[PDB]
Each structure stands twice: as structure tokens, then as C-alpha cells.
Design a protein around this ligand. Structure first.
Ligand SMILES: *[C@@H]1O[C@H](CO[C@@H]2O[C@@H](C)[C@@H](O)[C@@H](O)[C@@H]2O)[C@@H](O[C@@H]2O[C@H](CO)[C@@H](O)[C@H](O)[C@H]2NC(C)=O)[C@H](O)[C@H]1NC(C)=O
Ligand SMILES: CCCCCCCC/C=C\CCCCCCCC(=O)O
Lengths: 267, 242, 86, 200
């Protein structure tokens, strides 16, 4: 659904911070000058300059404390060089409503600790160093109170504002482009029919190969691929015997077509 | 911790003044509050860091300056009677780790008057224990009386054999108006010191009641007949009686 | 363990000779994020729910008939740079 | 806004005291109680995050977010507790470091007088034996001093002194005038003083 997150990528000693609304980036952190960078005018949303500075400041301190507070405990913790720590935090909306929030930390690409309720909890998988890592974090509760306030009251207020602020950007409809092609030969006597749908927005889409109304199973949906303009691209393929091919057509359903689907016949 | 300068001040209407708050605690946040008797704290101005400042709930007539991290100055542009109040400076970390809450100064008592001729130092008298009390309770109470001073800016203490004393002491928390019917009424204040009767009947023992008054500075202009009502100590004393 | 980058090369519009287009390269699914890819601009480094990173690379161009550019990638999992065309 | 019980409260020593604030703004999330002694600055006493109780010695701070009602409880109140109690509240981050203060409640804790001995004494000026002061002392805490209806006769509130060395407390009030007719017998006539008050 609709989800704003802030991600952290720690390498060991660079450090990256960005803020994303789903697949779309909206915030960047300037390494040199310690500053939240808005990528859209409405990147800022409800908040005001007063607040933003206050938050930016809060992000500077807290990140520092967390960063220096690792090579401080890197040795005590099993953590051996080199390694990467990944943090994702934020909140989501299920049809215009606050559908909960999250904050998860990852060691080496596998889950490590999660923030639940008012404190840190280990993933059982990550073993007995994860359980130790929590004992450290949970030691000062006031730290946990602040984490909690941001996840469950700051973030929800924020995302709502953002949404409203960029209702001209998101909520917009960009009509898709549709064309057909051969794929790699699956074997003698057969073909791969390839339906191309490119440059559509928003992201949900329906693409299926059709024999009249006979929705052909075996239609095979590919990755939804991005472009720098925020639009999406998608291939749907079908393997057929050569003769079967002319009977076939491609049907594309998208929000911007408003009921008038795209139909491409193989002939 | 958090310190304020000055602790007392008198202002003729229209005069200006700067208050200075300093803290060596490395705090990012600093605040200026005023507190009127009975009420709580209202925020005048505050600062989230060096070089920036912002308006509070009651900012009018005041300005501020966050010069270093340590210092936060408050300025009265043009004194008005309404600004007669007690002023508190406060500071606190940006993101404290041991919970919220701010540290406070001990306060600055400021009084604005229309005329500097309304300022008077206290008169001090010490009153000796009753023979009756001594004979009945085997204890001896001394009473101090500071009278006729304005404004309400005094600090009273007892001195026995040249050392300040606290045990056996009780001073009025607020002064009386000698003439409640006036706005610019002068004030009276009392205090007790109780000691055993055998400690009072000794003529070697010396009891002195001291009142620190905070009035006009040397810079203030004074054209009246009576002596300039400057900041001063007025004391009264008594010896033991057998 | 570590993960190998999935490389997908493609174009923004259907490729017609002599018409301005865009060439994207979607490098996904890899870990860790130490990766190098081939005047070109890319996207900020994000990661999916399974914690693996993904990047997008793009360049404006004109698809001719004697040329077919590629996407070269080297990783801490790769013994040799993997080159993918279009 | 933050409405706080104006008081003042006068309780006997040993009593449970309850101090309360009400607020209207639901955004409030940080709750502070300050204690301020006479002629000194506010000092943080209790702090709580969101809904709940926190117990520190004789003190319990309590926050009920759905009722928008917060409370400071003092168990076994000592006379040392006499002060003004101010509550303050901050909204969720970003809150600008700002907090809103209730107008405070002033609490007086009357100390228990183990052996009362009410009396009114005359005291003479150590200098000019003519000036004269009346001392009402050693009365019980349930006894109340009343203001003078004569505006030329001044009478102070009661005040508690503590002869720490002798484990001894005492209430007292002072009355004086430079009116000539004034005498100690009639000094506290507007006060309901004990029948057994000693008049020398
Ligand atoms: C910014 O916005 C959040 C939510 O945005 C508002 O939500 C609706 C009330 C509507 O007015 C939209 O236009 C806004 O986008 C605010 O949070 C709510 O605030 C209102 C009053 O401000 C209050 O009645 C609600 O209970 C709040 N609900 C929440 C917190 O979810 C908030 O006021 C704004 N805060 C900031 C500084 O961003
Ligand atoms: C850089 C973009 C700033 C994001 C703006 C919106 C702020 C509120 C959103 C949710 C923040 C959740 C992240 C919690 C921070 C925890 C700090 C840490 O432990 O690393």
C-alpha cells in the first residue's frame, strides 16, 4: 500500500540516508553540510521551516550517536569486518488511514532487531548476539520513548501532509503505450509472444494474453521495471505453437484508460 | 548550573535594561519566562541554538539575543509598570537522554515605578525576648522588624556570634503593605529566631538581624533631600541579658 | 551469504532508428552494496524487503542500426564483469 | 490550555495530597511536574512519557490521556513539602522544546505540634525601650490567625520555625502598631485564639 520509509545504509566507513514514499524518493541527506534535501517542492508537506530544522537536527545527533555507538561496540558484539547495517523506518496507510508503523534493523542482509511496542526485540533467527544487541539498546528507555514518538505520532502526521501536498504529482494518470514482439524461440515450431506496456502511472496494471475472451493461463508476467520519470514498464509473455498465434490478442487494463482497454491483435 | 544577573532591579518608567543568563552545561535550548504572583510561567522568548531566537507566548516589549551558546540576553526596550514581575531563565539539552524537564535560574525580581522618589530602605529593629516567655517555656524568641521599604526587594538573615544561622529561624514569606490602600505602598517584614533561654541569658552572646536592601544604583539620578535610597545593608543588634 | 546482481537492460520507448530514446539498466537483488556499473546518471541506492539493494542507470540516446550498447557490472560475487545487451 | 487547581491547599502532616491538572489539547505527550519553593526557582520533580504511572519515593505521577487528567500524589506529606507545584506539558515531536505551564497550586503542610502552649508575649525594642511588638507563639496547627480589621494594626501570617537541635517545632505570629492604645491583650482579638492562651 502507501508507505513512507526512511532508510539507512551503513558500510564498514560511509553512511547513507534517504526518505522514500513507496518506490518514489522524496528526501535526500547531504553528507557534507548535514541537511535534509527536498527533491520535490511538496517534499516538505505539512511541516514548516521551524519544524524541519528541528527534525534535521534531531536526525543529525541521533545518527551520530548510533554510528559512533557501533565501532564503539563492534568488538563487543560479534560483528567482524567488513559488514553492513541496514535500517528501515516509517509508517503506512491502508486506503487513507494509519495502518500501523515499523522500524527494522538488518545485519549483513538478514533480519536482526525490530522495534515493537516501546522497545527493541530480536528476531529469533538472528541468534544470541541479536538478543544481546537489544539488551544494549533497551538499557536507556528515554531513548526508546523518542523512537516511539516519531514512529507513532510524528510519522503519521507527516505522511498525511505529504500525500495532500503532492496530490498533483501522485493521484495523476499517465496513459500507457502498448506494442508487440517476438521473444527468444522456445523451441522448434514455437514462439514467444511478447506484449509491451511502457510508461504507465500509477503502478498497478493488468496485462493478459487472450483468445477472444478466453483468458490464456500461461501468460507470464515479468518484473515491473522503473524509469527516471517515475513511470513503469512491463512485459507479459506467452509461449505458443506457431499456428496458434494469429488467433491471439493482448489486453491491457489500467486506471487511465477508464474502461476503454487496449487490445492488440497479433495480426 | 544556570545563573541570572542581576537578581534585583528597579526601573523608572521608560528606562531600559538587559538581563543576562548564562549556563556552562552545554545546553542547546534556552528560555526566558516571566512569572506573576499566583500564576505560572509564561514564555517570553526562546532560542534553539547559537544565533537564532524565537517568540514565546508573551513576547511584546521584550527582545533577546543568543550571543554564544552559553549566554542568552533579555532586553526591556522601554520599561512599563506592567513589566513588574519575576523573570526566569531556563535551559535544557536539545535531545536529553535522561528525560525531559528544564533547569531554572533562581530568578530576577524587577519592579517598574513611575517615580524614583518612591524608593525607601528598610528600618530595622530587634526586639528582645519576653521575661514571661523565658520563665514559662525555658526558650527565648527574638523578633526582627524591617519597615517602610520599597520596593519589595529584601533579603533577611540572622547572625549569631558573627556566623549566619538558619536553625530556629522563621521569616515571613511575603511582606505586608503598610498602607494597603496604595499601589505604591511601602512594606514591612518580620522574622523570628528562637534559642534556648540559657543561650540568651549569656551577655557574651551577640544577636544581629541583617536586612539586605536592593534599590537604586549609583548611576540613577537623585535630586531629593533624603539620602539616595541605594542598595545597602541595614542591621540591628542585641546582647544577652542575665 | 552474498547475492548476485540481477541485470535487466531495456529502453523507455519502442526503439525506432533515428528517434530520441532512453536506455535504462535495472541492477537488482544484490548484496552487499559495493557495486560498480557501466556521461551517465544513476538513482539513489535503495533496497527491497528481503534487504537486497537495487539501482537504476540511464542515458539519453538514439538507437541506430550498427550500434548496440551494453551494461557492464562487477561485484564482490562476480569473478568476472557480466555484460548484458539489448 | 492547562487548567490547574488553584488551591491553596492546607493539609495536616501525614496526609495524602493530590495535585491535578486538566488539559484540552490531545497532542500533549510529555508531562512534567515542577516544585517551586518560596522566593526560588522551579525545580523538576517528576516527568512521565505518555499514559501511565511512575513512582518515586513518596511521589506518584499519573497521566490519564483519555480523561486528559494528570495527578501528582504525595504520600505521608512532610512540612518540607510546602511549596508551589506547577505542571507542564509538551506536544509530540517536533515540539520546539516548548512546554505549557499550569498556573500552579500552592501547598502548605501544617506540622503536628506535639505539646502546644499558646501564649501572647510583649517584646521591647533593644534600643528605644518604647517601641513594642506582640508575639503569639506555641499554638496548635489547627489554630488560625486572622488579619486585623484595624488597618493601623499589622498582623503577620503564622510561620513555622524548627529548632533542629532540640527536635522542636513552633508556630508563631507577630502583631505590632505605633498607635499608642495598642496592647498585647487585644492584639489578636479578631482571631479565634484558644481559651487557655497564656497572657502575662
Ligand atoms: C499536519 O497534518 C496532520 C494530519 O494532516 C491533517 O489531517 C486532517 C485533519 C486534515 O485537516 C488534513 O488537511 C491535514 O493533512 C495533522 O494531524 C491532525 O491535526 C488535526 C488538527 O491539526 C487534529 O484534529 C487531528 O486529530 C490530527 N490527527 C493526526 C495527528 O493524525 C496535524 O495537525 C498537522 N501537524 C503537523 C505539524 O504536521
Ligand atoms: C531524512 C528524511 C526525514 C523524514 C521526515 C519525517 C520524519 C518522521 C518519519 C519517521 C521517522 C522514523 C525513523 C526513526 C528514527 C530512529 C533513529 C535511529 O535509531 O536511527
Amino acid at each position: 500500500p502507501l508507505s513512507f520509509h526512511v532508510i539507512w545504509i551503513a558500510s564498514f566507513k560511509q553512511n547513507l540516508v534517504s526518505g522514500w514514499l513507496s518506490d518514489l524518493q522524496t528526501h535526500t541527506w547531504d553528507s557534507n553540510s548535514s541537511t535534509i534535501v527536498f527533491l520535490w517542492p511538496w517534499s516538505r508537506g505539512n511541516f514548516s521551516n521551524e519544524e524541519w530544522k528541528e527534525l534535521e537536527t534531531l536526525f543529525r545527533i541521533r545518527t551520530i550517536r548510533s554510528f559512533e555507538g557501533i565501532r564503539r561496540y563492534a568488538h563487543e558484539l560479534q560483528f567482524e569486518y567488513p559488514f553492513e547495517i541496514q535500517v528501515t523506518g516509517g509508517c503506512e496507510l491502508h486506503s487513507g488511514k494509519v495502518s500501523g508503523s515499523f522500524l527494522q534493523l538488518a545485519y549483513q542482509g538478514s533480519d536482526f532487531v525490530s522495534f515493537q511496542n516501546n522497545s527493541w526485540l530480536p528476531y529469533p533467527v538472528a541468534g544470541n548476539m541479536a538478543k544481546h544487541f537489544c539488551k544494549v539498546l533497551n538499557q536507556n528507555q528515554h531513548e526508546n520513548d523518542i523512537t516511539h514518538n516519531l514512529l507513532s505520532d510524528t510519522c503519521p502526521r507527516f505522511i498525511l501532509g505529504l500525500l495532500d501536498a503532492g496530490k498533483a504529482h501522485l493521484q495523476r494518470q499517465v496513459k500507457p503505450e502498448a506494442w508487440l514482439s517476438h521473444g527468444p524461440s522456445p523451441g522448434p515450431g514455437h514462439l514467444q509472444l511478447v506484449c509491451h506496456v511502457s510508461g504507465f502511472y500509477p503502478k498497478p496494471v493488468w496485462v493478459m494474453w487472450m483468445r477472444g475472451e478466453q483468458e490464456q493461463q500461461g501468460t507470464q508476467r515479468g518484473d515491473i521495471l522503473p524509469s527516471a520519470d517515475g513511470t513503469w514498464y512491463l512485459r507479459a509473455t506467452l509461449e505458443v505453437a506457431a499456428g496458434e498465434a494469429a488467433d491471439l490478442s493482448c489486453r491491457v487494463k489500467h486506471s487511465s484508460l477508464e474502461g476503454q482497454d487496449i487490445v492488440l491483435y497479433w495480426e | 548550573g544556570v545563573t541570572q544577573t542581576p537578581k534585583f532591579r528597579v526601573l523608572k518608567t521608560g528606562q531600559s535594561m538587559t538581563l543576562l543568563c548564562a549556563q556552562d552545561m552545554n545546553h542547546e535550548y534556552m528560555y526566558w519566562y516571566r512569572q506573576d504572583p499566583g500564576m505560572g510561567l509564561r514564555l517570553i522568548h526562546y532560542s534553539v541554538g547559537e544565533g537564532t531566537t524565537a517568540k514565546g507566548e508573551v513576547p511584546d516589549g521584550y527582545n533577546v539575543s543568543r550571543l554564544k551558546k552559553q549566554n542568552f540576553l533579555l532586553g526591556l526596550e522601554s520599561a512599563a509598570p506592567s513589566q513588574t514581575s519575576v523573570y526566569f531563565c531556563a535551559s535544557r539539552y536539545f535531545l536529553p537522554t535522561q528525560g525531559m524537564g528544564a533547569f531554572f535560574g533562581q530568578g530576577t525580581r524587577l519592579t517598574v515605578v513611575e517615580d524614583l522618589n518612591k524608593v525607601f530602605p528598610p528600618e530595622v529593629a530587634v526586639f528582645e525576648p519576653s521575661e514571661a516567655e523565658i520563665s514559662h517555656t525555658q526558650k527565648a524568641t527574638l523578633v526582627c522588624l524591617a519597615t517602610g521599604f520599597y520596593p519589595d526587594h529584601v533579603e533577611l538573615s540572622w547572625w549569631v556570634n558573627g556566623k549566619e544561622v538558619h536553625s530556629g529561624v522563621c521569616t515571613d514569606p511575603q511582606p505586608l503593605k503598610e498602607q494597603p490602600a496604595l499601589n505604591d505602598s511601602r512594606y514591612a517584614l518580620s522574622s523570628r529566631l528562637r534559642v534556648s533561654a540559657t543561650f540568651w541569658q549569656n551577655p557574651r552572646n551577640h544577636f544581629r538581624c541583617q536586612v539586605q536592601f536592593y534599590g537604586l544604583s549609583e548611576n540613577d539620578e537623585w535630586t531629593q533631600d533624603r539620602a539616595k535610597p541605594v542598595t545597602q545593608i541595614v542591621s540591628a543588634e542585641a546582647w544577652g541579658r542575665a | 551469504i552474498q547475492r548476485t546482481p540481477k541485470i535487466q537492460v531495456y529502453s523507455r520507448h519502442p526503439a525506432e532508428n533515428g528517434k530520441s530514446n532512453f536506455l535504462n539498466c535495472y541492477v537488482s537483488g544484490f548484496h552487499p552494496s559495493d557495486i560498480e556499473v557501466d556521461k551517465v546518471e544513476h538513482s539513489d541506492l535503495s533496497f527491497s524487503k528481503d534487504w537486497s539493494f537495487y539501482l537504476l542507470y540511464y542515458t539519453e540516446f538514439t538507437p541506430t542500426e550498427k550500434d548496440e550498447y551494453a551494461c557492464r557490472v562487477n561485484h564482490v560475487t562476480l569473478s568476472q564483469p557480466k555484460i548484458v545487451k539489448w | 490550555e492547562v487548567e490547574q487547581d488553584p488551591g491553596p491547599l492546607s493539609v495536616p502532616e501525614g496526609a495524602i495530597v493530590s495535585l491535578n491538572c486538566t488539559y484540552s489539547n490531545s497532542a500533549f505527550q510529555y508531562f512534567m511536574w515542577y516544585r517551586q519553593y518560596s522566593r526560588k526557582g522551579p525545580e523538576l520533580l517528576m516527568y512521565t512519557y505518555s499514559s501511565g504511572n511512575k513512582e518515586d519515593g513518596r511521589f506518584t505521577a499519573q497521566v490519564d490521556k483519555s480523561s486528559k487528567y494528570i495527578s501528582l500524589f504525595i504520600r505521608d506529606s512532610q512540612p518540607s513539602d510546602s511549596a508551589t507545584y506547577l505542571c507542564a506539558m509538551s506536544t509530540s515531536l517536533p515540539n520546539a522544546g516548548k512546554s505549557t505551564f499550569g498556573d500552579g497550586t500552592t501547598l502548605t503542610v501544617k506540622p503536628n505540634i506535639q505539646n502546644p502552649d499558646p501564649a501572647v508575649y510583649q517584646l521591647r525594642d533593644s534600643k528605644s525601650s518604647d517601641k513594642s511588638v506582640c508575639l503569639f507563639t506555641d499554638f496548635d496547627s489547627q489554630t488560625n490567625v486572622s488579619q486585623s480589621k484595624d488597618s493601623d494594626v499589622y498582623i503577620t501570617d503564622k510561620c513555622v520555625l524548627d529548632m533542629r537541635s532540640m527536635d522542636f517545632k513552633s508556630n508563631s505570629a507577630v502583631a505590632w502598631s505605633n498607635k499608642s492604645d495598642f496592647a498585647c491583650a487585644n492584639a489578636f482579638n479578631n482571631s479565634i485564639i484558644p481559651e487557655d492562651t497564656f497572657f502575662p
